[PDB]
Design a binder for these strands. Structure first.
Lengths: 136, 205, 1120, 166, 52, 94
RNA sequence: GACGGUGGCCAUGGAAGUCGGUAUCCGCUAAGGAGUGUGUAACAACUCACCUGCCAAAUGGACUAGCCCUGAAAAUGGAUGA
């Protein structure tokens, strides 16, 4: 799932961390944390984490949030990777700290996206682009 | 097939070796190119004058039947079996035997398909065809240029040239006018009269 | 029109008889895109098709190709053209694909509808279901033919094929016409011709000059083979088209000078102009020349397409010029191949100039056609109508001028409500209350506020771009946001969304009402209003308020501040509707109840009762999940009532957790609804449905029942009935070959019964249930019956003046009129087929007079033993020959029941009984201050004298007695011969020559037989009659469709139930009888499982008690 | 000819199963059914009136299509005559139920009626026609002399010869 | 035409005989699988026919 | 005719190419063997003829062409479409 | 060429050789089962059984056992010893 990239996949993979990394929910829904289970499309090989997306969809969970949203897996969307990258451009976007949002399995983000969102992510997921006034 | 043509001899030696050519007169006519439907009906006039006889495998054992009968086998140097034919027994006169089946000669519906003469007129088949269809069919003599929802083709005559006799006629064009000329078959190959063979004639002498 | 406002429309909407209701409709929403596309462009309050396609309307090419994609929506499409108003409104009724009540409901939300009929297939369950209602109503529906630019663009044919297509359409429609009505003369009109203008003075006079030729209606005033005064159309939408015959005519007119009417006639069928100088010579009217469409009009279109394909800039322009219209602006602005076409078909598209006139010509007023649509659907009922004398107070004068009153009282009519907890836009807030502000918003929230919205959205959290000219400019709806407001307005606020919280009072519906204003009162009616109920389906007519006549007496009023369909949503501005309209109830009302028509009158004869069933009785006894949400389901079913006409919520016959539907998938849909769009719970479904009737074939043999039909000596009727059960629980004592009695006390209190067949007509009426519950119980307290006594007799023949049993009556002399009083348990539901036979005044304190059922007849006293009888034999009628289910298709007989039996048979069982009760023998006459024996004597009037010396207070105790009656009866049934009387709907399937065999095959596969065929007079269509069971008739239409292409149209009429060969058994509940071992296939069939999860049904009765009672679990059976 | 108005128009002979009234004829034949403009109910009158106690099940019924101008001629077959001979109530109202209750001869009372009806067919008449008649139906059994559905060139039920007028 | 061409089409594809081993479409009046691996089986379904 | 099959040619070079074929937007060029000509009295966008001298080669070429106008995925009773040899072993009248 | 009584009787608007079932008989013929299939709503049409034309002398089945093939896949490269 979902899947819709992009055109392209907005080029190479970069992560803040793979499996077992907290990033904030950045969402009006009362998920307060997002912890990764795994990432979609990772086919992977012998001993290698299923590694965080640059703006791609993930199997996640609400570890600390609303108890209703707590437990039960959730497809999400990575929004900003603390750990850095170069783009086809020659810039190195880098962030304060990791972040994403909990989302629908057609990609759609629920409420409104908080804070700054890398443009690649927006490009990937049109709903994301729609539901924010910050796309930097 | 698998047999003596199709099956063993002991069915067609029963109405061949038993039923001879032993009669007043005979005429050898081609009438196996016509359907049994109307042939069996016009067999009513044939069974009065005699009957039809023999399967055509025993045509070379007909010599031992012409020793018994007074008439010979080869009168005009023919065994009288070269195509699909019959032998009509006859007791009519020399001139009237030549018109005993020609007065009632007629074709019939076929099982493996046969031609019809396109010199004579083709009867009217399906009537009230589509206007577009009619327009398309330019080979029809009286054609239209699209008229209303429905229109007659208007054809009670031949739709193709006069000249093509039976054998080399267009059967594909007789499907356009479904009812086709039934005026073929039941014709004499030779006119035999017990030791006096005349040529095949449609009319009396 | 690009510019229209609601300020102009509200004034012109008040007046009536010059408005003309028009509606959009199709068989499965086929040709919906085309109709809508052309209308959107026309409409001005949405600002053309540039800022169009808002307020729910999803256009698709799939649909055109052939596709349903059904949806419930509405666009506010009013027109302030010239000097008049035009209440069109884009009605999109979803309907349903199979025949049903749903189809009847949804489709009836239309006045003066245009109907798209036959997509590329006819004579289906689709077309004969939805449009079955529309063509029945004489509302002057116009013939809309399918897309013609498919033949030009997609398939790529010449315009000559258009004619062919038209012809085909006509042919298709002929079949449809011949389902109802008659279509022997109309097969001539299912062609393409114009036989007029063959004369020399016409061929060069009215073809050069104008003159005039008639285009008026002929024979039929429906959609079958008529021009409808120049409103027939060829509706397309690939780049948007809005055109038809009129358009074609117009072009022709422009070439030399011929009248439009004349031209239209020519263009309906074929006409042959030679084109020398537009003058014709005869000879070409019997042979032909060249039809019109390929000569001119569509030829031009074809040429244009060709030009486009090749890519020519001036050629296209030339073609356009030739076609008799202006060439437009975008010819050297863009490269313009399709763009040019698009440009032209925004200038060309506003049909309001042409079509409105045509509409007017067709339809002088909506007042006229309203009189012809009352007698075509339910208004009094299925029997009578309001147009006839039954139910006539002030209706005939009212619906001639339309509406109930000219001052607007409001009414109701079901057309399926909107889904709550999603849309909840009707509110009690200032901006909908203020009717002007909302109107203003509506006219400004198409492409004007959109820019503002955009500005708000992108530039509020600050910095979307990084080092760009977005934050630098900071737009307030100026130069940047002006773009992207012509192809589609980005974020325009289409339906005026919810600013404040949800308060759901949404409803779809229809109402015809006069001039309604804001702050208008209506007298709200209760959850069950009796007066209303009493008015419908009978000749009664009266208007009075509650004086204790309804269940709830009330003197309260409800407000009604608006009339809305939710087409522009919220409390609208356009509320001043004329007599006759497409809108439903508004204000704070979503009550479209069955027994509560919202009116200003406190009670009135209901104008439309709820819709009728296509196939009678489709049910399922489901149960919900999790404990607190049990009444939730019930609550939901109150909302379900509002939506669909039939659900078992009002009046308990089978209990409130049961659906009532007509259809194949309708039931399924209903099931899904109460998980989704009503109550948000989740429930246990059970797709096995409809328990069949259990009929006993014949009586039992000589055992303890001497009055009988001789012998039951058969091996098996279909499955064995002798060795499968019985003969050892209470058969070791008596009966060798079976068991028709009991020996628990062992001849202290015993009985014997019989189950004969009963004639089928009689059964049918019984099972309809004409008798009431009060007709069989408590006649001393309530009123003593009279009209009901003879009716019963007419059905089941038995009386208190019959001392030779049931046998005499069943055989000889049917339909007598006598009193059938003093009956305990007349059937399983107390209104059914069974009866307990009185063949005695008094045996020995048994079998005479009910608990309080009387005919004013007594031998000595009314007192007898009615308490132990009535409860016992109710349970005997509810456990069949395989346990469970009601005895249906049966007239029960009681040979004898004898209490106070001083005889007895020496055995172990007897001994045990003796030990238990310490009785030397049974009685009632005597006592030792021991045991029980309850009777009717004690509660009615104390002691019993005359019929017996002492009252019954002795013999086996009452509970035990009650138990034992059930047991013996159960035993008797089990041993009797029985067959499965399967439930049936006869299939009167409209079929054609090629698809009879296929239909028959299906029937063969799924049980039944073809009885006979009836042929329609003068057509290739027929109607085949064939019985088919009810269980297999579900998913039938779909199957039919799959088999060929839906060329046969099914419709399931109810034709009683029949006996067919299937194994009528199910494993016995008693484990002593399961030692015989009923087989897993033949004594537990898949057809015979309608009981484990298909029998939880009780408004009236479904009680099954645990048999045998004898003190405690240690003292029940010790020597036994 | 084309179906456009009701007859007289489609003037042509058609063989029909018209004869019965509750199985063998509910509404018209399968050839005249799928056609255009023509009254499909007037075909009920030719069987109900002309054949009230004659052969019901798949009768040999010729009727010229002029519609309310038909001869109601009855050419018949060997299985119709037997039916006719048998009483009314066992023939009709028994068309979804089998019947084998005929023991009436066609070798004496129907013997001479064979040639009067059929006088122009493939078969020979007088000598030949007597044998076909003697076995062309399963309902009737006949007396000893001839019997159906066994050889007619050897033993029959008394007759051994190829032809002998019983 | 379309009937005269559909038949032709069928003849080239749908109306041949498959094996019950190799499933190999032989020819409309076939009698052996004509393969080495099969062993010319002499067991032959006619390939199915359908209206859809 | 849903996606009308459109075949074109060059003679001399002796090649046939199939443009539209079951919505295939490619060309399927197939070089005919030497000694094969191709004319076409089409009736309703149907019929190609290929005439040649060596039976063995012309026939082969035809077969190849036929093969090329075929789909390798999904049912064969689905699409009953492609090129199909109506009349082989046909000899012109001289 | 492959007919008639004939739409035999059943079931069945209808299913006529052929949804399906039964009895399965005779006329005329060289020749034709109340019929092998395809097909038809069903009839028809075609095809078979069955008969003749032509070519012109061999042919058809059913097994039997010799070699060959199918069956017959496993792990470092590979062994009639090469």
């Amino acid at each position: 799932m979902s899947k819709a990239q992009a055109v392209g996949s907005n080029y190479r993979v970069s992560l803040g961390l793979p499996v077992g990394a907290v990033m904030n929910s950045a969402d009006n829904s009362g998920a307060k944390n997002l912890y990764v289970i795994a990432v979609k499309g990772i086919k992977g090989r012998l001993n290698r984490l299923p590694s965080a997306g640059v703006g791609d969809m993930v199997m996640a969970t609400v570890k600390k949030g609303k108890p209703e949203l707590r437990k039960k897996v959730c497809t999400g969307l990575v929004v900003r990777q603390r750990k850095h990258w170069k783009r086809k451009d020659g810039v190195y976007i880098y962030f304060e700290d990791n972040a994403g949002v909990m989302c629908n399995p057609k990609g759609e983000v629920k409420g409104n996206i908080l804070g700054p969102v890398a443009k690649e992510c927006s490009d990937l997921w049109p709903k994301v682009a729609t539901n924010a006034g910050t796309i930097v | 097939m698998s047999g003596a043509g199709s099956k063993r001899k002991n069915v067609f030696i029963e109405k061949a070796t038993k039923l001879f050519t032993t009669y007043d007169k005979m005429i050898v006519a081609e009438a196996d190119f016509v359907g049994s439907s109307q042939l069996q009906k016009i067999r009513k006039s044939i069974r009065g004058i005699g009957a039809v006889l023999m399967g055509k495998k025993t045509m070379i054992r007909k010599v031992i039947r012409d020793l018994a009968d007074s008439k010979p086998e080869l009168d005009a140097l023919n065994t009288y079996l070269k195509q699909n034919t019959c032998i009509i027994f006859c007791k009519d006169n020399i001139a009237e035997v030549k018109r005993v089946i020609n007065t009632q000669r007629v074709g019939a519906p076929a099982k493996a398909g046969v031609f019809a003469p396109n010199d004579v007129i083709i009867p009217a088949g399906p009537t009230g065809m589509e206007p577009t269809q009619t327009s398309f069919l330019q080979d029809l003599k009286i054609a239209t240029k699209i008229n209303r929802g429905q229109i007659d083709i208007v054809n009670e005559v031949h739709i193709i040239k006069t000249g093509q006799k039976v054998g080399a006629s267009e059967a594909t064009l007789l499907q356009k006018l479904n009812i086709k000329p039934f005026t073929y078959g039941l014709e004499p190959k030779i006119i035999y009269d017990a030791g006096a063979c005349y040529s095949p004639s449609i009319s009396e002498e | 029109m690009v510019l229209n406002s609601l300020d102009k429309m509200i004034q012109l909407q008040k007046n009536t008889a010059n408005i003309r209701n028009i509606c959009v409709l199709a068989h499965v929403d086929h040709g919906k895109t085309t109709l809508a596309d052309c209308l959107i462009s026309s409409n001005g309050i949405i600002s053309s098709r540039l800022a169009g396609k808002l307020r729910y309307m999803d256009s698709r090419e799939d649909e055109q190709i052939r596709g349903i994609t059904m949806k419930s929506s509405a666009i506010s499409l009013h027109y302030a053209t010239g000097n008049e108003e035009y209440l069109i409104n884009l009605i999109d009724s979803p309907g349903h694909v199979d025949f049903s009540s749903e189809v009847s409901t949804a489709v009836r939300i239309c006045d003066g509808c245009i109907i798209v009929v036959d997509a590329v297939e006819g004579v289906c369950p689709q077309t004969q279901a939805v449009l079955r209602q529309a063509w029945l109503e004489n509302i002057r529906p116009v013939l809309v033919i399918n897309k013609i630019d498919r033949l030009i663009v997609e398939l790529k044919f010449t315009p000559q094929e258009a004619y062919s297509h038209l012809k085909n359409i006509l042919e298709q429609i002929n079949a449809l016409t011949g389902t109802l009505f008659t279509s022997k003369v109309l097969e001539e009109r299912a062609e393409r011709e114009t036989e007029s203008q063959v004369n020399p003075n016409s061929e060069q006079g009215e073809q050069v000059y104008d003159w005039s030729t008639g285009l008026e209606d002929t024979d039929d005033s429906h959609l079958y083979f008529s021009p409808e005064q120049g409103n027939v159309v060829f509706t397309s939408a690939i780049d948007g088209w809005g055109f038809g015959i009129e358009h074609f005519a117009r072009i022709y007119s422009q070439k030399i000078g011929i009248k439009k009417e004349v031209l239209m006639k020519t263009l309906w069928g074929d006409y042959y102009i030679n084109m020398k100088a537009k003058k014709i010579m005869k000879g070409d009217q019997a042979k032909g020349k060249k039809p019109l469409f390929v000569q001119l009009i569509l030829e031009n279109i074809w040429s244009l397409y060709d030009a486009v394909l090749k890519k020519d800039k001036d050629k296209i322009d030339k073609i356009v010029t030739s076609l008799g219209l202006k060439i437009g602006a975008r010819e050297a602005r863009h490269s313009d191949p399709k763009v040019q076409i698009n440009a032209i078909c925004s200038q060309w598209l506003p049909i309001s100039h042409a079509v409105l006139a045509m509409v007017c010509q067709k339809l002088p007023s909506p007042l006229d056609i309203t009189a012809e649509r009352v007698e075509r659907l339910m208004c009094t009922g299925s029997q009578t109508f309001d147009s006839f004398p039954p139910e006539t107070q002030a209706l005939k004068a009212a619906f001639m001028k339309c509406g109930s009153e000219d001052t607007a009282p409001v009414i109701i009519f079901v057309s399926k409500m909107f889904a709550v907890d999603a849309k909840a836009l009707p509110q009690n807030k200032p901006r909908p209350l203020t009717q002007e502000e909302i109107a203003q918003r509506r006219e400004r929230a198409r492409q004007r506020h959109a820019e503002k919205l955009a500005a708000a959205q992108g530039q509020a959290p600050l910095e979307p771009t990084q080092d760009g000219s977005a934050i630098e400019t900071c737009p307030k709806g100026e130069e940047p946001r002006g773009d992207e407001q012509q192809v589609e307005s980005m974020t325009p606020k289409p339906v005026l969304q919810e600013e404040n919280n949800q308060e759901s009072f949404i409803a779809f519906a229809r109402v015809f009402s006069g001039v309604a204003r804001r702050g208008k009162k209506i007298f709200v009616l209760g959850p069950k209003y009796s007066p209303l109920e009493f008015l419908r389906r009978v000749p009664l007519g009266f208007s009075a308020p509650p004086d204790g006549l309804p269940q709830v007496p009330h003197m309260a009023y409800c407000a009604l501040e608006n009339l809305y369909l939710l087409m522009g949503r919220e409390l609208e501005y356009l509320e001043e509707v004329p007599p006759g309209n497409v809108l439903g109830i508004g204000g704070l009302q979503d009550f479209v109840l069955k027994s509560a028509t919202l009116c200003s009158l406190p009670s009135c004869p209901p104008f439309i009762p709820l819709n009728f069933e296509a196939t009678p009785i489709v049910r399922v006894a489901v149960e919900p999940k999790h404990p607190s949400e049990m009444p939730q389901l019930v609550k939901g079913m109150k909302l379900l009532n509002q939506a669909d006409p039939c659900v078992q919520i009002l009046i308990q016959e089978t209990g409130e957790h049961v659906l009532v539907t007509a259809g194949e998938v309708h039931l399924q849909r209903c099931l899904d609804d109460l998980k989704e769009r009503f109550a948000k719970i989740h429930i246990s479904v059970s797709e096995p449905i409809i328990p069949f009737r259990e009929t006993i074939t014949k009586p039992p043999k000589v055992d303890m029942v001497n009055e009988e039909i001789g012998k039951q000596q058969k091996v098996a009727v279909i499955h064995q009935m002798k060795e499968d059960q019985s003969k050892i629980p209470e058969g070791i004592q008596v009966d060798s070959d079976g068991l028709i009695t009991i020996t628990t006390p062992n001849k202290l209190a015993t009985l014997s019964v019989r189950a004969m067949p009963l004639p089928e007509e009689v059964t049918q009426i019984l099972e309809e249930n004409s008798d009431l519950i009060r007709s069989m119980e408590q006649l001393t307290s309530s009123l003593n019956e009279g009209e009901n006594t003879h009716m019963i007799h007419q059905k089941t023949q038995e009386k208190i003046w019959e001392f030779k049993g049931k046998l005499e009556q069943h055989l000889t002399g049917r339909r007598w009129r006598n009193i059938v009083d003093q009956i305990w348990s007349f059937g399983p539901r107390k209104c059914g087929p069974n009866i307990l036979v009185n063949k005695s005044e008094d045996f020995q304190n048994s079998v005479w007079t009910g608990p309080a059922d009387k005919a004013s007849k007594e031998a000595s006293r009314y007192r007898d033993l009615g308490n132990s009888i009535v409860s016992g034999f109710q349970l005997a009628t509810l456990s069949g020959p395989m346990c469970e289910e009601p005895l249906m298709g049966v007239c029960f007989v009681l040979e004898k029941w004898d209490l106070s039996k001083f005889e007895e048979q020496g055995a172990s069982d007897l001994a045990k009984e003796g030990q238990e009760e310490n009785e030397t023998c049974s009685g009632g006459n005597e006592n030792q201050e021991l045991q029980d024996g309850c009777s009717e004597a004690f509660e009615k009037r104390t002691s019993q004298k005359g019929e017996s010396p002492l009252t019954d207070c002795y013999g086996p105790f009452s509970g035990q007695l009650i138990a034992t009656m059930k047991e013996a009866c159960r035993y008797a049934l089990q041993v009797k011969p029985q067959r499965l009387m399967a439930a049936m709907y006869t299939c009167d399937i409209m079929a054609t020559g090629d698809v009879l065999g296929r239909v028959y095959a299906v029937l063969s596969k799924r049980e039944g037989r073809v009885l006979q065929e009836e042929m329609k007079e003068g057509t290739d269509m027929f109607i085949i009659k064939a019985v088919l069971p009810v269980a297999e008739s579900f998913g039938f239409a779909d199957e039919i469709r799959k088999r060929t292409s839906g060329l046969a149209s099914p419709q399931l009429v109810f034709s009683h139930w029949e006996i067919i060969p299937s194994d009528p058994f199910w494993v016995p509940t008693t484990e002593e009888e399961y030692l015989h071992f009923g087989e897993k296939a033949d004594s537990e069939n898949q057809a015979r499982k309608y009981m484990n999860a298909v029998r939880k049904r009780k408004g009236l009765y479904v009680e099954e008690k645990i048999v045998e009672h004898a003190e405690k679990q240690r003292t029940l059976s010790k020597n036994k | 000819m084309p179906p456009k108005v009701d007859p007289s128009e489609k003037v042509e002979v058609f063989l029909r199963v018209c004869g019965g009234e509750a199985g063998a004829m509910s509404t018209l034949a399968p050839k005249l059914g799928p056609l255009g403009v023509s009254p499909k109910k007037v075909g009920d009158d030719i069987a109900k009136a002309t054949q009230p106690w004659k052969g019901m099940k798949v009768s040999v019924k010729l009727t010229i299509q002029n519609r309310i101008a038909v001869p109601e001629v009855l050419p018949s077959a060997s299985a119709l005559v037997i039916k006719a001979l048998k009483e009314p109530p066992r023939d009709r109202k028994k068309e979804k139920n089998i019947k084998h209750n005929g023991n009436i001869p066609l070798e004496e009372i129907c013997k001479i009626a064979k040639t009067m009806r059929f006088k122009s067919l493939a078969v020979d008449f007088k000598g030949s026609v007597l044998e076909i008649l003697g076995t062309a139906h399963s309902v009737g059994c006949k007396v000893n002399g001839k019997s159906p559905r066994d050889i007619q060139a050897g033993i029959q039920s008394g007759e051994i010869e190829v032809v002998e007028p019983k | 035409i379309e009937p005269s061409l559909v038949i032709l089409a069928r003849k080239y594809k749908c109306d041949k005989m498959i094996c019950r081993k190799c499933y190999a479409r032989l020819h409309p009046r076939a009698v052996n699988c004509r393969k080495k691996k099969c062993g010319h089986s002499n067991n032959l379904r006619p390939k199915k026919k359908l209206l859809k | 005719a849903h996606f009308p099959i459109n075949v074109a040619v060059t003679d001399g070079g002796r090649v046939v190419e199939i443009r539209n074929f079951f919505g295939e937007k490619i060309v399927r060029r197939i070089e005919l063997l030497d000694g094969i000509t191709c004319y076409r009295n089409e009736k309703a966008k149907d019929e190609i003829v290929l005439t040649g001298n060596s039976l063995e080669l012309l026939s082969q070429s035809c077969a190849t062409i036929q093969l090329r106008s075929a789909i390798k995925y999904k049912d064969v009773r689905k699409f009953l479409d492609g090129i199909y040899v109506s009349e082989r072993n046909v000899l012109e009248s001289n």
